[PDB]
């Protein structure tokens, strides 16, 4: 919440067709040293896959709600234990809903026009979604105008290019492709890999 | 409409200095299996090269507007016959218009932002201009949050990364450039290659 | 103001930490044969940066604001006599007010949504923030729907691609890291072989 | 005032026809670290530039006159602002007033029958004009009998032995055409190469 980011700087997508699939890879993703994780709404019923995950919370796993494309699906996420509202929206309706409940909201954000809506409404995280398509000159663009504005892109990230974003400046990084494919224990080594790899740069 | 693009998976746009010009072009890339049309309003008097290639629209040719900016020029494009709706725009008062009148409408998205207002407002088709600026990488990465989506990128797009765009998952495309450039044999002849590569992969 | 810019083609981004330094800085690029020079409002007490560097514009230099998110900023540049009011914003207050008051405004736009916008409000110069993740091939593409719009690519420009901007037809460039990093001196030098590049192409 | 002498050892005779050039070509000196900025009254007007370059006292520029042959001359000169008297004279209705009005004077002599005039006229700073013609010998000989005596050799003074006069016991330097020659770019620079080389020894 604007402080485990500076420590975890990891954020899991976990899109899964299955809500069985969606636990084994969560845990997969948390065995790998992958702390906080994101919840996508595309998984079927994830709402129950957000209150039924609560026993991974006791263990030091902070689990959030992802896509979250209306103000039904956000309270479906608070009530469900979820500690984060991730949207590829910069929803006025959805950002004021989650101030009123104190909740955390990070809106996705691509030009300059939606990220000084974005400030004026009170955040200073965002989401830059896509990641590749702005690249990682975006960012370093970006740094001279708003200092203050903390950047999480996730989407198009890998082993290559993880540790560019890092030395551009952004908070965190979202990976869900490379991250959340292939078996469990695939899933768990790739996880691993990715905290290492941050922690050396 | 949400079917033919599935067929014929090409839209040419056809940009013109004069009236006899673009219909022979129209007629060229015809000729070389472009069924469907669309005459952009940046050509001088487009309504007028509208409601006199009507012609074409018997052999199986369909044509639509393109670059509508203006609630004047939908009614002027509607009134004339035209199938389609084109605009970079994404003009809250024509596609209310398009919808009141039943004509078909897809509106040009670069922005996640953008894309939610496009699907909140009724639209699943979308115009993904510019095309080569978001690059190949966009709908890639945009089918998770939004698989329902489907995309046309017209702009940028010649035979080097056609087969490209339709491996990532592309409903149709739009040539504008490669198309529509040069004497109408060449016109022909290359609209007849694109119908070839695209259906070769 | 629309006719300064095809002849200087050359926009100087001075970003500060001091106020010395952003005067011995604009000192150094007004050498090097840059004319118009717009401050950052980013700089610490940039009002009185404009305020105390008016000497500079009895030799010809045109100086003006950056940076101007809020209305405030607006007035506090109009009133220390600055002739640009320049922003990453598409803000609806600050182009009434700077339209109220006779005052050149230039919006940062990136999609051809906030362009059309812009276009609506009466603009047709505009900011092509940023430069370096559109690329080269997003006025080349948008050259056709509105040829009459002219742009300032501000930031990522450099030696190897500023003529490339100028051949896919840009009016002016803006500069603000390789211009305006280094001693005085080296500032000058880097103007002067800017202004020099520029001429050459 | 016989103490900047010792820090900056520098002195700028700028020699220029127009008003416009005096002023670029001081400020390009200025860039290039010469803080002590002398105005040859041979330019056209030059009251009018020292009054119009009072914008540059405040960032640490020392401004005055040079070749004061006459009482209105220095008059002007104190009027307008500036900071030093330098005259090829060693004229006694021009020192006394100098006095009066409590304004620096450096009288330039070239026979110990002047530098015995001006000693006890009450100077001890002096120039030394010509300084090529002297030599370097001239300080070094003159040394014994007047040890207190301070030698600005202005005239005659390169890159090539701009470090003997300092060797040969010089509180400063007067350098008007290796400077001041050449376009303001490359002013500065060689101004820089003349502050870097009197720093190294």
Same mark, same amino acid.
């Given at each position: 919440m604007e402080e485990l980011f500076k420590k975890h700087?990891?954020?899991?997508? =976990?899109? @899964?067709?299955?809500?069985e699939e969606a636990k084994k890879k969560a845990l997969a993703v948390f065995l790998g040293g992958v702390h906080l994780i994101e919840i996508t709404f595309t998984v079927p019923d994830a709402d129950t896959v957000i #209150?039924? =995950?609560? *026993? =991974? #919370? /006791?263990?030091?796993?902070?689990?959030?709600?992802?896509?979250?494309?209306? +103000? /039904? $699906?956000?309270? #479906? %996420?608070? /009530?469900?234990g979820a500690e984060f509202i991730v949207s590829p929206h910069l929803d006025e309706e959805?950002? $004021?809903f989650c101030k009123e409940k104190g909740v955390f909201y990070m809106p996705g954000v691509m030009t300059p026009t939606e990220l000084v809506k974005a400030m004026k409404l009170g955040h200073t995280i965002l989401k830059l979604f896509p990641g590749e398509v702005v690249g990682p000159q975006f960012v370093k663009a970006m740094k001279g105008p708003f200092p203050n504005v903390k950047f999480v892109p996730t989407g198009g990230v890998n082993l290559d290019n993880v540790c560019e974003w890092f030395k551009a400046g &952004?908070? %965190? +990084?979202? &990976?869900?492709? @490379?991250?959340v494919k292939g078996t469990p224990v695939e899933v768990?080594?790739?996880?691993? %890999? *990715?905290? /290492?790899?941050?922690?050396?740069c």
């Open positions: 700087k990891i954020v899991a997508v =976990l899109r @899964a067709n299955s809500v #209150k039924e =995950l609560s *026993f =991974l #919370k /006791e263990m030091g796993a902070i689990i959030g709600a992802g896509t979250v494309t209306s +103000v /039904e $699906q956000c309270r #479906k %996420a608070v /009530e469900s959805i950002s $004021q &952004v908070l %965190a +990084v979202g &990976v869900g492709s @490379a991250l768990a080594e790739k996880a691993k %890999a *990715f905290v /290492e790899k941050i922690r050396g």
